[PDB]
């Protein structure tokens, strides 16, 4: 049926042939191993027939890789790049190009994920410790985490920390916090059951001993620098905590919150060398007094020892987190903003305290110059003491001032009272000042104004305390040195430039160069999130196009991009369900059914949304126990708000009758939340919206190629059926309302579409793959997983399988029997795989003591075979212990991993060879050998001796 022209002149290229690892030969052979005739036969035996697509996906024709950038350029060039002095928590900065090139555009930094396996992850661990040390020094507090999602959510996390600490149900918020910060904190308080009150400090009475805490901002949203010493003292006298939203650059010359008694300091690290990104991604900082550290949200690097006593790094106090404590965790947060936290650390490293003081003083002096010129021109300043931000009452018409600003393509903040906000930044020079003085009608140039001339350095607020004195911040100031340091850290970390990372539940697929390119384009990276929308029409088209495609892949009617992680998606989705229920008079319904196999984020998100959790048992075959499910639905039927399911299941298995589960919940007045992290087994074959699901988050950093970033950034957009659409998140600066009926749940992220600048990656994957390619990717993810399971099944027990004996995109290897037969633990197998050149699969979840393996469609048959052969050879090592051929205390498994220092030493006292230690199979060669940089990590020691800043060098 093809046109004659298509036969003579086919498509230049098919991106799917690059993205998908196995070719025709690989696929036939894998099918042969499975005893199957075709891919359709595998799918027919795996995915239940009654939930499969009735017609293929309706998508646009695929775009050739050689045209994707020009196609996307026709969109991005519709944005306008103005000079934005809007402020409001986003300030332009000068991103060092050497960090941009050697870290952000380096696949050796961005393809790895959360540092789960410390011995092959010491590089990013050290860098995040640098971030923590930077934040503690600048804020003046004791401990800081390894990033939050953004400023407003960090402020919300402070509120929740205060509630956890003292259980009081009142919380004060200064109305001079940024508007988006207020909205996120109010939304978080609403569903947690805390009452917020908007009050200026002089209206705050703590004397009832009923206030959990207070949030204020320094400098505040109007630019003012205030002394909060007395306010903090009052709070404390009545048992309340004090929380300060602040600015790392301002704090380079301002006495910091730690020095006026603050308990929690938080803000964005964006202006420390990360692009505006039309909202993100940016690492928020969050730091506390030492006495609050047990309640810290998120990850936090700590110092510990390895098996030799060497000082080394590891994620610390991990029982705080969702994966151990579930609904009792300190937060739902999982993917955070790791890569961007590391960008901001490297900024601070490259500049040192001296270079950061230089920038800060320059910015403040530009602001002081601007202020003097505006006063001389007859305009009034509302505050005399500021860092970078002025609040101006125009001495003439505001209209005529703004007409002049438009002529020079400059944006100010327009306050509702008719006054103007101007926030200067690192990028501001003489020419920009002269433009600004002209906008305000001032005859005199910046040079002239300077001549007749203070601020922070002449005030009682000037900083007198040191910061960034550790050698890491005083060593890498030449470009040659910084490049060498970034490389040293990269090379410590195994990543997708080395080998498959078959992390179950993570989807470690290809992050392609063509998809990645656009994120550093100026038309995407350099737009302030709150510009007038006629400057961001390119972003508007991007959002429309990506929404429509995501709607078609999922069977949903509307997508909301605000949630900036999967867990944020779960929280937003659950809150939207509750707002739906509330509006329709069913607000008494708060019970959420959660199978015990759910990801830990699920119960943590449900708790954060104010729901009551009812666990549902899983049966011996791995499926939701239907007896217990029916009993829990009957028990809670009057108060049932929702169920959280995952399809296919978190063990990789397709449930046989998932529509029946959806129908049972619907019949009892609940909504169905479907966790979309496993959509790599669905795309182009079935759709959660077709079988009864009402809302799902998607993980664009798993299924849709956003890079894993060493732990972030992510995007967790939610798709909803149209009955939920009126209740989707809104934003107080940029309105997201589409319909007449709108009744928004609130605001869940600081920026209206979250981390907007990374969405082109997923748009690009989708547009290049098309309908056929997207289907083929899922088909191959399933083929690759089943092929590995088949190869391993006579050596390890494949724990759970579907009705006809097939898995989905991942499977569990049950290593538990080896505990009794050989004193071997799953951790021994994980560490030993490092010696075979592999980052371990997912460990001990959903089943403790086992491994969950997800290869993805991006890895080829030869790579799958290397991994299977490694496992087979490890099975034989275990058999050597089982059968008494090697010492059960000192053998390769128990001594793994084998560091370079171990295998190169003069000593050697092992009952096995160096060759067996370090090159256990012939594919592990000196030419490709990746070294674990340390011996086995000590998980206990670090938590007993807590050290979460850079130790002395």
Instruction: Please report, as ranges, the residues that interact with ligand PLP according to CB under 6 A.
Output: 334-335, 505, 565-567, 599, 601, 646, 650, 675, 677, 699, 714, 716
8 binds, among its own copies, ligand PLP, none (CB under 5 to 8 A by kind): its own copies
* Separation in Å, CA 223 to CA 24, 182, 324, 375, 420: 63, 17, 42, 17, 11
At its nearest, how many Å lie between its own copies and the CB of residue 77?
Answer: 12
For its own copies, the closer CB: 98 or 659: 98
342 binds, among its own copies, ligand PLP, none (CB under 5 to 8 A by kind): none
For ligand PLP, the closer CB: 334 or 829: 334
At its nearest, how many Å lie between ligand PLP and the CB of residue 336?
Answer: 8
For its own copies, the closer CB: 695 or 903: 903
At its nearest, how many Å lie between its own copies and the CB of residue 345?
Answer: 18
594 binds, among ligand PLP, its own copies, none (CB under 5 to 8 A by kind): none
407 binds, among ligand PLP, its own copies, none (CB under 5 to 8 A by kind): none
| CA nearest to 402, candidates 429, 367, 363, 441 | 441
97 binds, among its own copies, ligand PLP, none (CB under 5 to 8 A by kind): its own copies
At its nearest, how many Å lie between its own copies and the CB of residue 519?
Answer: 12
- Residue sitting closest to ligand PLP (CB): 566
At its nearest, how many Å lie between its own copies and the CB of residue 618?
Answer: 34
At its nearest, how many Å lie between ligand PLP and the CB of residue 270?
Answer: 20
Instruction: Quote the CA–CA distance of 346 and 348 in Å, as a whole number.
Output: 5
Which tokens belong to 545?
């196009």
At its nearest, how many Å lie between its own copies and the CB of residue 376?
Answer: 15
| CA nearest to 711, candidates 301, 311, 313, 319 | 301
At its nearest, how many Å lie between ligand PLP and the CB of residue 521?
Answer: 25
For ligand PLP, the closer CB: 758 or 768: 758
Bridge-based pairing state of the strands 264-268 and 241-246: parallel
For its own copies, the closer CB: 369 or 401: 369
460 binds, among its own copies, ligand PLP, none (CB under 5 to 8 A by kind): none
For its own copies, the closer CB: 66 or 583: 66
At its nearest, how many Å lie between ligand PLP and the CB of residue 132?
Answer: 20
Instruction: Quote the CA–CA distance of 619 and 622 in Å, as a whole number.
Output: 5
Angle at 687 between CA 683 and CA 693, to 5 degrees: 140
For its own copies, the closer CB: 263 or 515: 515
Which tokens belong to 97?
């190009």
Structural contact between residues 788 and 803, judged by C-beta atoms closer than 8 angstroms: no
At its nearest, how many Å lie between ligand PLP and the CB of residue 243?
Answer: 24
For ligand PLP, the closer CB: 135 or 852: 852
| CA nearest to 82, candidates 411, 404, 389 | 411
List, as own/partner pairs, every contact residues 72-78 make where C-beta atoms lie below 8 angstroms and the sequence separation is at least 24, other chains included.
Answer: 72/518, 72/760, 72/763, 72/764, 75/538, 75/541, 75/542, 75/545, 76/518, 76/521, 76/523, 76/524, 76/538, 76/542, 76/760, 77/523, 77/538, 78/537, 78/538, 78/541
At its nearest, how many Å lie between its own copies and the CB of residue 773?
Answer: 13
| CA nearest to 314, candidates 949, 953, 951, 938 | 938
Which tokens belong to 782?
């399933």
Which tokens belong to 848?
């403790």
For its own copies, the closer CB: 491 or 739: 491
* Separation in Å, CA 427 to CA 424, 611, 649: 8, 46, 50
Angle at 348 between CA 343 and CA 354, to 5 degrees: 160
98 binds, among ligand PLP, its own copies, none (CB under 5 to 8 A by kind): its own copies
Instruction: Quote the CA–CA distance of 624 and 32 in Å, as a whole number.
Output: 33
926 binds, among ligand PLP, its own copies, none (CB under 5 to 8 A by kind): its own copies
For ligand PLP, the closer CB: 566 or 920: 566
* Separation in Å, CA 268 to CA 185, 203, 347, 909: 15, 28, 14, 51
Instruction: Quote the CA–CA distance of 854 and 52 in Å, as a whole number.
Output: 22
Burial class (CB in 10 A: 0-12, 13-18, 19+), 697: buried
DSSP 3-state assignment of 131?
A: helix
Instruction: Quote the CA–CA distance of 367 and 328 in Å, as a whole number.
Output: 47
* Separation in Å, CA 39 to CA 24, 854, 884: 11, 19, 44
At its nearest, how many Å lie between its own copies and the CB of residue 37?
Answer: 25
Instruction: Quote the CA–CA distance of 520 and 339 in Å, as a whole number.
Output: 14
Question: Which residues share a beta bridge with 592?
Answer: 613, 642
At its nearest, how many Å lie between its own copies and the CB of residue 331?
Answer: 33
For ligand PLP, the closer CB: 84 or 601: 601
Q: Where are the alpha helices (DSSP H) in 140-283?
A: 151-166, 179-192, 229-237
650 binds, among its own copies, ligand PLP, none (CB under 5 to 8 A by kind): ligand PLP
429 binds, among ligand PLP, its own copies, none (CB under 5 to 8 A by kind): its own copies
423 binds, among its own copies, ligand PLP, none (CB under 5 to 8 A by kind): none
What is the chain's length? 953
At its nearest, how many Å lie between its own copies and the CB of residue 29?
Answer: 16
Burial class (CB in 10 A: 0-12, 13-18, 19+), 803: middle
At its nearest, how many Å lie between its own copies and the CB of residue 479?
Answer: 4
566 binds, among ligand PLP, its own copies, none (CB under 5 to 8 A by kind): ligand PLP
For ligand PLP, the closer CB: 141 or 508: 508
Question: Which residues share a beta bridge with 214?
Answer: 172, 242
Which tokens belong to 133?
């040390």
Instruction: Quote the CA–CA distance of 467 and 172 in Å, as a whole number.
Output: 31
At its nearest, how many Å lie between ligand PLP and the CB of residue 632?
Answer: 21
For its own copies, the closer CB: 459 or 491: 491
For ligand PLP, the closer CB: 85 or 556: 556
69 binds, among its own copies, ligand PLP, none (CB under 5 to 8 A by kind): its own copies
358 binds, among ligand PLP, its own copies, none (CB under 5 to 8 A by kind): its own copies
210 binds, among its own copies, ligand PLP, none (CB under 5 to 8 A by kind): none
Instruction: Quote the CA–CA distance of 658 and 47 in Å, as a whole number.
Output: 11
630 binds, among ligand PLP, its own copies, none (CB under 5 to 8 A by kind): none
For ligand PLP, the closer CB: 327 or 388: 327
For ligand PLP, the closer CB: 603 or 920: 603
675 binds, among ligand PLP, its own copies, none (CB under 5 to 8 A by kind): ligand PLP
Q: What is the Rg, in whole angstroms, of the alpha carbon atoms belonging to the chain? A: 28
For its own copies, the closer CB: 152 or 760: 760
């Amino acid at each position: 049926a093809s046109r004659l022209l298509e036969r003579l002149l086919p498509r230049h290229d098919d991106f799917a042939r690059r993205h998908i690892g196995p070719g025709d030969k690989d696929q036939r052979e894998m099918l042969q191993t499975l005893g199957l005739a075709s891919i359709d036969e595998l799918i027919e035996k795996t995915v239940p027939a009654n939930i499969r697509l009735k017609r293929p996906l309706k998508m646009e024709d695929p775009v050739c890789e050689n045209e994707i950038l020009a196609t996307l350029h026709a969109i991005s060039s519709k944005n306008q790049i103005w000079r934005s002095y809007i402020g409001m928590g986003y300030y332009n900065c000068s991103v060092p190009q050497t960090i941009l090139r050697n870290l952000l555009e380096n696949s050796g930094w961005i393809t790895q994920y959360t540092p789960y396996q410390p011995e092959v992850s010491q590089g990013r661990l050290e860098s995040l410790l640098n971030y923590q040390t930077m934040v503690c020094d600048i804020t003046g507090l004791d401990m800081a985490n390894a990033s939050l999602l953004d400023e407003g959510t960090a402020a919300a996390e402070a509120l929740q920390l205060c509630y956890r600490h003292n259980k009081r149900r009142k919380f004060f918020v200064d109305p001079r916090c940024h508007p988006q910060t207020i909205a996120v904190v109010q939304t978080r308080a609403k569903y947690t059951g805390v009452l917020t009150e908007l009050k200026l400090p002089c209206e705050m009475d703590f004397s009832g001993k009923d206030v959990s805490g207070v949030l204020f901002q320094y400098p505040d949203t109007e630019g003012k620098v205030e002394d909060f010493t007395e306010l903090v003292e009052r709070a404390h006298q009545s048992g309340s905590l004090a929380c300060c939203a602040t600015d790392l650059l301002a704090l380079c010359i301002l006495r910091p919150p730690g020095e006026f008694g603050v308990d929690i300091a938080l803000g964005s690290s964006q202006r420390f060398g990360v692009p505006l990104g039309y909202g993100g991604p940016h690492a928020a900082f969050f730091a506390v007094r030492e006495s609050l550290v047990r309640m810290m949200p998120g990850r936090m690097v700590g110092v510990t020892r390895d098996a030799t006593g060497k000082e080394v790094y590891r994620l610390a106090l991990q029982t705080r987190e969702q994966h151990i404590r579930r609904d009792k965790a300190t937060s739902n947060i999982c993917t955070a903003q790791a890569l961007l936290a590391n960008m901001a650390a490297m900024f601070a490293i490259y500049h040192g305290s001296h270079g950061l003081e230089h920038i800060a003083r320059r910015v403040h002096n530009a602001t002081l110059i601007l202020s003097e010129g505006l006063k001389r021109a007859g305009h009034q300043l509302q505050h005399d003491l500021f860092f970078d931000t002025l609040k101006i009452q125009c001495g003439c018409s505001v209209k005529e001032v703004l007409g002049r600003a438009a002529q020079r393509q400059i944006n100010f903040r327009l306050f509702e009272d008719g006054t103007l906000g101007i926030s200067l930044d690192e990028t501001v020079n003489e020419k920009d000042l002269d433009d600004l003085l002209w906008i305000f009608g001032c005859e005199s140039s910046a040079e002239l104004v300077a001549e007749s001339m203070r601020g922070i350095p002449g005030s009682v607020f000037k900083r007198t305390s040191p910061f960034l004195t550790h050698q890491v911040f005083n060593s890498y100031h030449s470009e040659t040195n910084i490049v060498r340091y970034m490389k040293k850290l990269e090379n410590k970390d195994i990543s997708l430039v080395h080998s498959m990372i078959p992390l179950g539940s993570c989807t470690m697929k290809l992050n392609s160069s063509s998809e990645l390119a656009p994120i550093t384009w100026k038309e995407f990276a350099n737009i302030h999130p709150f510009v007038p929308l006629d400057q961001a029409q390119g972003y508007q088209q991007l959002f429309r196009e990506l929404e429509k495609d995501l709607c078609e892949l999922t069977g949903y009617d509307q997508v909301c991009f605000q949630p900036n992680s999967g867990a944020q998606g779960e929280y937003a989705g659950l809150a939207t369900i509750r707002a739906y229920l509330n509006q329709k008079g069913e607000g008494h319904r708060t019970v959420c059914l959660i199978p015990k196999s759910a990801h830990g984020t699920n119960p943590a998100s449900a708790h954060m949304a104010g729901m009551k959790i009812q666990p549902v048992e899983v049966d011996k075959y791995g499926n939701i126990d239907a007896v217990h499910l029916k009993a829990m639905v009957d028990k809670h039927k009057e108060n049932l708000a929702a169920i959280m399911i995952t399809y296919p299941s978190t063990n990789g298995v397709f449930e046989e009758n998932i529509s029946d589960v959806c129908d049972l919940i619907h019949q009892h007045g609940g909504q169905v939340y479907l966790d979309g992290a496993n959509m790599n087994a669905q795309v182009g074959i079935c759709r959660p919206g077709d079988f009864g699901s009402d809302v799902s988050h998607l993980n664009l950093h798993k299924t849709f190629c956003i890079p894993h970033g060493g732990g972030g950034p992510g995007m967790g957009p939610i798709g909803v059926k149209k009955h939920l659409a009126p209740f989707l998140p809104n934003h107080p600066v940029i309105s997201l309302k589409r319909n007449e009926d709108a009744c928004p749940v609130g605001t869940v992220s600081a920026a209206p579409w979250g981390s907007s600048s990374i969405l082109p990656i997923s748009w690009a994957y989708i547009k290049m793959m098309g309908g056929k390619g997207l289907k083929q990717a899922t088909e191959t993810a399933i083929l690759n997983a089943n092929y590995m399971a088949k190869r391993l099944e006579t050596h390890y027990r494949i724990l759970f399988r579907g009705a006809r004996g097939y898995v989905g995109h991942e499977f569990i290897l049950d290593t538990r029997p080896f505990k009794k037969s050989a004193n071997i633990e799953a951790v021994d197998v994980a560490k030993r795989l490092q010696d075979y050149g592999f980052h371990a699969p997912t460990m001990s979840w959903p089943v403790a003591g086992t491994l969950m393996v997800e290869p993805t469609e991006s890895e080829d048959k030869a790579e799958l075979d290397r991994f299977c052969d490694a496992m087979i050879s490890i099975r034989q090592e275990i058999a050597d212990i089982e059968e008494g051929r090697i010492d059960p205390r000192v053998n390769p498994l128990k001594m793994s991993p084998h560091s370079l220092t171990c295998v190169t030493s003069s000593h050697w006292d092992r009952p096995y060879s160096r060759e067996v230690a370090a090159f256990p199979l012939p594919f592990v060669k000196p030419e490709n050998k990746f070294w674990p940089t340390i011996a086995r990590i000590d998980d206990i020691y670090g938590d007993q001796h807590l050290v979460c800043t850079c130790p002395p060098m």
